[PDB]
Amino acid sequence: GSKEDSVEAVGAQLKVYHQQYQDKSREYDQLYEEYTRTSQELQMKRTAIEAFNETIKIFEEQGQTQEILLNSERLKSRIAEIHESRTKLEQQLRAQASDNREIDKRMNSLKPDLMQLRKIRDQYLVWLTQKGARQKKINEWLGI
Amino acid sequence: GSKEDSVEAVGAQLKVYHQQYQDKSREYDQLYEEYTRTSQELQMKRTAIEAFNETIKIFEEQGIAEIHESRTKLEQQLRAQASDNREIDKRMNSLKPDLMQLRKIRDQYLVWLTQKGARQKKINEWLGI
Amino acid sequence: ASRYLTDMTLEEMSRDWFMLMPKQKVAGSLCIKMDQAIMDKTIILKANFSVIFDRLETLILLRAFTEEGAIVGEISPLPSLPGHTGEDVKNAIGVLIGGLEANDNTVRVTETIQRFAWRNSDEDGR
Amino acid sequence: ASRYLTDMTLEEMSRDWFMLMPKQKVAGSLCIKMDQAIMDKTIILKANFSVIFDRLETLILLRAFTEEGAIVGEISPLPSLPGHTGEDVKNAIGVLIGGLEANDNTVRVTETIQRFAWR
Hints:
It is classed as viral protein. The entry lists the keywords Vietnam influenza A virus, NS1, PI3K, viral protein. It forms a tetrameric assembly. The complex is a heterotetramer, with two copies of chain A and two copies of chain C. Helices cover 85% and strands 0% of the residues of chain A. Chain A is mainly alpha-helical. In chain A, helix 1 packs antiparallel against helix 2 (75-108) and helix 1 runs antiparallel to helix 3 (111-130). Chain A is rod-shaped and about 100 Å long. Chain C has helices at 10-14, 86-101, 111-115, and strands at residues 3-6, 22-27, 30-35, 42-52, 55-65, 71-77, 106-109. In chain C, strands 1, 2, 3, 4, 5, 6 and 7 form a seven-stranded mixed β-sheet that branches. Chain C is globular.
C-alpha cells in the first residue's frame, strides 16, 4: 500500500538496471575476448615479419659482397617474390591492427555506461537494503 | 513534527553546505588573484634578466661588474618566487574538485528541499538571501 | 572530462511556479511536471546537470520557461528515490517535449542541452 | 581519471546482519551503525565508492567484517535524503573506526580505502 508499492517498484527498477548491466557486461566480455585474440594474432604476425626482416638483412649483406650469367640471376627473382610476400604479410598486419583499434574504440565507448550502470545498480540495492528488504528479496530482484 | 523536522534538518544542512561553498570560493579567488599577480611579476623579471645579460654579452665583444651580481640576485629572486607561485598553483588546483562537488551537492539539496515543499523565501533564508 | 553545467540561476531553480492543469508523469526516478494549460507558446528548456566522458551523467534540475520568464514545466529527481542514468534523463526530456508540442508549443533546448542529452526538432509558429 | 571502485560483492552488500548492542550515529545524511557487543576482534572495512580526480567522491556502501566474515558495522547513505560529499564520508569512516577502537578492536582498511579515505 503506497509505501510498500513504492518499495516494490524500486525493486523492479533494480531488476531492470541489473539486467541492463548484465547485457552490457556480456557485450563487453565478447569484445574483450575478441581484442585479446586479435592482439595475439598481431604478435604472431610481427614475429613472422621480423624473421623475414632478419633474412632480408642477410640478403643486403650478401648483395653488397658481389660488387653474372645465371648463377645468381636465378635467385634474384624468387627472392624478390619473398620480399613481396613480406610486404603483403605486413599489408595484412596493419589491416588487422586497424580492426583491433576499432574494437578498442567500441570497448572504451562501453566503459562509461558500464560503470554508470554498475554504480546505480549498487545504489538501488543499498537503498532497498536500507528500506528493510532482506537478502532473499534482493536476490529475487537480481535473479540469482 | 517528523517530516517537517527532517525538512528543517536538511535546510540547516543546506545552510552549512552553502557556507562551505562560499568560503572555499573566497579562498580560491584570493589564490587566483595572487597567481595572476606573481605571474605578471615573474613575466617582468624575465625580460629584465633578458636586458641584463643582453647588455652584459653584447657590449663585451670589444674589451662594471656589479651588474653581474645584480643579475645573480634577480635570478635567485625569480627562482624563489616561481617556487612560491607553483605552490599557490598546487594549492588552488586541489580546490576545484571540492568546489565542483560542493556546488553540485548544494544545488541537489536545494532541489530536494524544493520538492519537499520549501518556498523561495525558505530557500533564500537558508541561503542568506 | 567530468564537468557540471548550469543553465539556470539559484533564483530560477528556487522560484515558485503554479500549474493550472497539472500533468505529472514519472520516468524512472524522474518526475516530469507540466502545465498542459499552456498553448501557442515558445518554450526554452534550461537545465543544470553534471557530465562525465562528454556524456550526460546526473541531472540536477531541468525547467521550462516562456519568453517572459514564466515556468511551465520541470524535470527533477524524486526525493525519496535513488538516482538515474543519462538515458532516463533523455527519456524525460523526450516525454516533456512531446507533451509540450502536443499543445502547439514551440519547444527549444539550450546549446548545452543540445550537446549531450537533447530532443526536439521544430514547430510551426502560432 | 574517474573510477567506481568496489571492495564488496553483491552478496556482501545484500547480506543480512544483526546487532546485539546497536549503536547508531547519523553524520549528515550518512548512517553509521555498529555493534557495541564486538570487543577484542580484528575487523576490516570494505567499501564500494566512486572516485574522481584520484579523490573519494561518493560512497555507495561500507561494511565492517570480522575475520570470520560477520558484518558488525555499516556506513550507508540514508534513503529518501539528499547526497553527501567526500569529507562527510571521510569523517564517518573515522567515527566508525573510533567507535570500534573504544571496544578494544583493532581496525584495518582495504588497500582501496587507504588510498582514497585513509583512517
